[PDB]
């Protein structure tokens, strides 16, 4: 899938280098709260400045401003300070990503220097539409278009899209790019290697593990799984889904999809024709509401759960369900969280199973994460949750696709 131009292939040398990265990091009061897809990135731009590159600008959008800048709220200038620290080199950002200012201190800048540009979606041309101050839903003028986007085409003399998050995103600096050479990065080639290999020639048994809060966003995926692998886990808050059509659990005020719901019997039909065994959990953790410090219960099947209450997280015989499938498996395929992880009340499943899938990768195990201290502890821990769903339902990735071919 990488028949195109990538950056191994690429003569850097002296060479100015723009490249869209993904810098897209959880945030916390403007405090990283996970560097994964920004360490993911350093790969790419030590061989541009080992290969005596003379700048690499480096370009992201940061959550989804709309087209609107919100320095307050959206700016990558956190990732530039660590950026700094895990490259070992000063990192040069810049208050904005096109325009006279950008393009003169991206004209010709001292040697080996690295330039982070501001969030992309300040401006309405990266998307090709915005929003404003109430519902005000903007559209981008196609000259306007042209010119950010021959303003990004000025600030490096190659192109590099190591950007494998923001792949399924068909904007202006993922796809819009007049440079002669568009090479593809080390991350978006690893990236596209760890899948492709996994849905080409799989070991087996192969497990998928799918978690999310509803089915109905899920069909295409499972669908399209359910043709490859041997074994699946519906976990988390779409699994109601599945137990009050299949099981009449009662599920209190947990999670419904009535969409899916109308669907699940044509999932299981199909899992079934082709021999796949569904293991959806059989007890909850459950909560009087949905935060973080709710009164916390416990629930099965067989016992439902009381009326108010909902299932945030799954409990120990599910677990142990789980860790059964995970056993079996020579791959693995984890998209989507089994429970509300991010409340530690709410987090053991999720926490119980990576630690089944760590000890499955010891064993020789395939394990593909998705999205604590994992990175290490598995094959291959993806920077691009929302694009690998998208490759795995056979979708088109406009990223890789505007790539420079051979």
Same mark, same amino acid.
């Given at each position: 899938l990488s028949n195109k131009l990538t950056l191994d292939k690429?003569?850097?040398?002296?060479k100015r280098v723009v490249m869209r990265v993904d810098f897209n990091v959880p945030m916390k009061n403007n405090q990283i709260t996970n560097n994964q897809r920004i360490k993911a990135a350093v790969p790419s731009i030590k061989f541009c400045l080992d290969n005596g590159a003379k700048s690499v600008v480096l370009m992201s959008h940061l959550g989804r401003p709309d087209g609107v800048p919100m320095p307050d709220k959206y700016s990558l200038e956190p990732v530039a300070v660590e950026l700094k620290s895990l490259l070992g080199k000063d990192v040069l950002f810049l208050k904005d990503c096109v325009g006279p200012e950008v393009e003169k201190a991206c004209a010709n800048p001292a040697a080996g220097s690295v330039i982070l540009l501001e969030?992309?979606?300040?401006?309405?041309e990266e998307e090709g539409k915005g929003k404003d101050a109430s519902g005000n839903k903007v559209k981008a003028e196609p000259a306007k278009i042209e010119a950010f986007r021959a303003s990004l085409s000025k600030l490096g003399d190659v192109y590099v899209n190591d950007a494998f998050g923001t792949a399924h995103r068909a904007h202006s600096s993922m796809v819009g790019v007049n440079l002669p050479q568009k090479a593809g990065g080390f991350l978006m080639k690893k990236e596209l290697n760890y899948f492709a290999k996994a849905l080409e020639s799989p070991e087996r048994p192969f497990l998928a593990i799918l978690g999310g809060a509803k089915v109905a966003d899920k069909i295409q995926l499972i669908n399209n799984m359910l043709d490859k692998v041997n074994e699946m886990i519906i976990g988390g808050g779409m699994a109601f889904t599945f137990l009050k059509v299949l099981?009449?659990? !009662?599920?209190?005020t947990s999670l419904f999809d009535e969409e899916g719901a109308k669907i699940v019997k044509d999932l299981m039909s199909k899992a079934e024709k082709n021999g796949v065994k569904i293991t959806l959990p059989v007890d909850f953790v459950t909560?009087?509401?949905?935060?973080?410090?709710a009164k916390t219960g416990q629930a099965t099947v067989a016992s439902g759960i009381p009326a108010g209450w909902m299932g945030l997280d799954c409990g120990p015989e599910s677990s142990k369900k789980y860790a059964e499938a995970v056993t079996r498996a020579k791959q693995i395929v984890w998209n989507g969280?089994?429970?509300?992880? !991010?409340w530690e009340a709410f987090a053991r499943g999720t926490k119980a199973l990576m630690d089944e899938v760590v000890k499955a990768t010891s064993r020789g195990c395939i394990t593909i994460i998705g999205g604590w201290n994992t990175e290490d502890k598995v094959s291959h821990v993806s920077t691009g949750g929302g694009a690998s769903l998208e490759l795995l339902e056979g979708k088109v990735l406009p990223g890789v696709d505007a790539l420079s071919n051979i």
């Open positions: 690429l003569d850097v040398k002296g969030n992309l979606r300040f401006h309405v099981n009449n659990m !009662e599920i209190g909560a009087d509401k949905f935060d973080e410090n969280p089994v429970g509300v992880f !991010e």
